[PDB]
């Protein structure tokens, strides 16, 4: 179909652009934090971990751009086929669960400002972020194992694909990818940011007697849904097609195209998260200004 020809023509440019902005943003974050090497805030621990996760996340995109150029005829070795898609599923989990960890800490820090004064947060922060990097590594092992180069006879290409050994792995893939990757952290993010926003509404209500933060807190949930809901929606339609709960030429054309567009669109998260979680803050902007004052 024409749409695939168009996709092969244009989608590498979109991928390369999202890669470029992702590298630029996350490198800028990492620099402005780590250039004054010796110390960081507890918030900056999570934010630096997040910027690193989104950096390594977009680091795999140029290979996929140069795979869609060459028309999905995977140019690289079978090992790189395992490694790239492994680090891309790992950093999906690590980035998403780090924005969970941020929203949790931010809840503890803004809804309980005194108890989070007494609690030893910085230890829990280091432990949590490195535990997330570990568990996100481990949850990627299934991708390292099952991703393999195979011929696709309908297309006359060798493509880097999941050689899923049994149909049970479709249920395992969809349960882990939609429920753990999108659905559980969405629910946690919405819980924490609701309790935050309700507390800041109460603070504003009392303060007025004698809205940027609400805009940012809603922008977190909006950006998360905009990035991740389209892909996990198409992934759900794919799983339904593997169940043949949906069936026909329309569905297979729609799903297969949408998975590509939505998947590479989801990498916009690596570009938006530096903006929303870092660049908008007055503190960060002063930290830029004062490290421009020490060129």
């Amino acid at each position: 179909p024409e749409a695939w020809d168009l996709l092969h023509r244009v989608l590498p440019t979109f991928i390369i652009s999202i890669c470029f902005f992702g590298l630029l943003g996350n490198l800028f974050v990492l620099l402005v934090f780590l250039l004054p090497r010796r110390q960081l805030n507890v918030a900056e621990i999570y934010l630096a971990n997040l910027a690193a996760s989104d950096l390594v996340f977009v680091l795999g995109l140029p290979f996929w751009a140069e795979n869609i150029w060459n028309q999905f005829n995977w140019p690289f070795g079978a090992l790189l086929c395992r490694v790239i898609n492994g680090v891309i599923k790992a950093n999906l989990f690590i980035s998403i669960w780090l924005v969970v960890a941020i929203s949790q800490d931010r809840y503890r820090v803004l809804v309980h400002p005194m108890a989070s004064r007494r609690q030893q947060r910085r230890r829990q922060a280091r432990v949590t972020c490195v535990l997330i990097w570990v568990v996100g590594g481990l949850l990627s092992i299934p991708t390292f194992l099952l991703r393999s180069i195979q011929a696709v006879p309908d297309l006359n290409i060798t493509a880097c694909i999941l050689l899923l050994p049994h149909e049970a792995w479709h249920f395992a893939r969809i349960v882990e990818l939609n429920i753990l990757g999108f659905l559980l952290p969405l629910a946690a993010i919405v819980f924490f940011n609701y309790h935050i926003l309700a507390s800041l509404r109460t603070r504003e209500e009392v303060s007025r007697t004698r809205s940027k933060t609400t805009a940012l807190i809603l922008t977190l949930v909006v950006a998360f849904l905009v990035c991740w809901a389209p892909y996990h929606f198409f992934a759900f339609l794919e799983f339904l097609f593997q169940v043949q709960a949906v069936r026909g030429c329309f569905w297979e054309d729609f799903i297969d195209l949408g998975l590509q567009l939505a998947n590479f669109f989801a990498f916009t998260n690596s570009s938006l998260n530096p903006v929303i979680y870092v660049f908008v803050g007055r503190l960060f902007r002063t930290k830029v200004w004062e490290l421009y004052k020490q060129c």
Partner: peptide
């Protein structure tokens, strides 16, 4: 139908 896994995730 393209195989599963045809895309990055």
């Amino acid at each position: 139908k393209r195989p599963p896994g045809f895309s990055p995730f």
